[PDB]
Amino acid sequence: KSVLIAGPCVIESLENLRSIATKLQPLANNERLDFYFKASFDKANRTSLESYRGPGLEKGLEMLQTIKEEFGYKILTDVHESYQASVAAKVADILQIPAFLCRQTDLIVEVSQTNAIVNIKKGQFMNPKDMQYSVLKALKTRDKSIQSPTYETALKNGVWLCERGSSFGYGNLVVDMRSLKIMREFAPVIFDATASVQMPGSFAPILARAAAAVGIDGLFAETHVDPKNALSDGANMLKPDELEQLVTDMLKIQNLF
Amino acid sequence: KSVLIAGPCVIESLENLRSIATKLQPLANNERLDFYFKASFDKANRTSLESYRGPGLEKGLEMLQTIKEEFGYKILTDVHESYQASVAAKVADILQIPAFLCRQTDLIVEVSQTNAIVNIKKGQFMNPKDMQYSVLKALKTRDKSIQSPTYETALKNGVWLCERGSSFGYGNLVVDMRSLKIMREFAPVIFDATASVQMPSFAPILARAAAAVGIDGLFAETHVDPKNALSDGANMLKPDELEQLVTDMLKIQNLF
């Protein structure tokens, strides 16, 4: 089963969450997918001081819980501080390490001491080869006999790596498709199609197809019922219909190989 | 006075700290410098689980305060997480935000709520023009009326920017000297001459380069005996090397 992780960037309100959850119900019941609903409870890196923060840990997890109960969804959320990990793992089936935190030992350790799947996003200037060390800190926490990380051992131990692009000059993101293959020696690989589109002066579908042709274990996409009215920078996100098409195309590609 | 911030990467032991402190006395007493001694109480991004962590906030701060007392040095240290800032600032004269955290709003706000000077390292893939937003968050915290960040305003309220290079492909780092000028419009600029790509000498040359462009200070990792440094024993300067580098900067700055 290919993994699909999908939902809005940040939790905005219970009704917005219910709305997007509802639009994703057909994807979630697709027996070819292993589905996880996502939303951040905090926006730690917001553009400016008065920018929307999100509801915070306690109210945000209550909300993700309600989605899990009403829709039957497994949940992914991300964690920025060690001491969030334990309580978040009681609602989230996956805990995500943000890309900028991907070398933070204590965070990785704490998250790995929980029972959740650990999804480590690759830093924007990290060499994909160096992501083995982050996988290994997690694996060693879960099984202190492991000396080197492998796909099969990371899979049995619930540790995954996520491609979100590399910085390319100032204000540009490029996806080196080679990294998908390289990181897959170490762990299952998820492709974040909506992070990685950014050029100065949508590409998400075409990169998702490229990624599926190379070989990925799953897809991650930020999705909103109405991007123009989102409380993020609304530029990165797909509509549900757009995501359905993208997923349709990935499965056809994957079924060739 | 130009700022010099110098000390080891991490607190190894009290005697090691005392030893590096002693060797920095000549630079600490230099009439042309505004000197701060630094060292991290925690190394948050070590490449292995077994690797040395540093002594932790409590004990590390206690060690730095001892240096402050014994040597009369003002202190810089870095903060990595919530609820460190206020306690760190009882000892540290400068609180530093590491480069990968340079856009973390809550961390900026929290550090800026203390009495400390705030040193914001530029992210390895940040456009220097975008550092103006980090400065403004810190500035607004200290004075709500400020709408746009400026050198004069950042200097008065103790918010500095620090250049540490930009990622250039994989496993390589490049200093865009233009960033020194660009960032200086927003705040005083320190150049981190020991900036190096971590791997999971050109320092004097870049320092002279940066002094010629225009900087408000220099930051350098320094160790008495780098080969026996608990981390990272590859990129630090020896005390005498730092002196040479400081000499050349002052001469270049004296032309202007």
UniProtKB/Swiss-Prot annotation, chain B:
The keyword Cytoplasm applies. Its EC number is 2.5.1.55. GO terms for biological process: keto-3-deoxy-D-manno-octulosonic acid biosynthetic process. It is found in: Cytoplasm. GO terms for cellular component: cytosol. Keywords: Cytoplasm, Lipopolysaccharide biosynthesis, Transferase. The keyword Transcription regulation does not apply. Coiled coil: none annotated. It comes from the Bacteria. InterPro entries: Aldolase_TIM, DAHP1/KDSA, KDO8P_synthase. Pathway: Carbohydrate biosynthesis; 3-deoxy-D-manno-octulosonate biosynthesis; 3-deoxy-D-manno-octulosonate from D-ribulose 5-phosphate: step 2/3; Bacterial outer membrane biogenesis; lipopolysaccharide biosynthesis. It catalyses: D-arabinose 5-phosphate + phosphoenolpyruvate + H2O = 3-deoxy-alpha-D-manno-2-octulosonate-8-phosphate + phosphate. GO terms for molecular function: 3-deoxy-8-phosphooctulonate synthase activity. Belongs to the KdsA family. This is 2-dehydro-3-deoxyphosphooctonate aldolase.
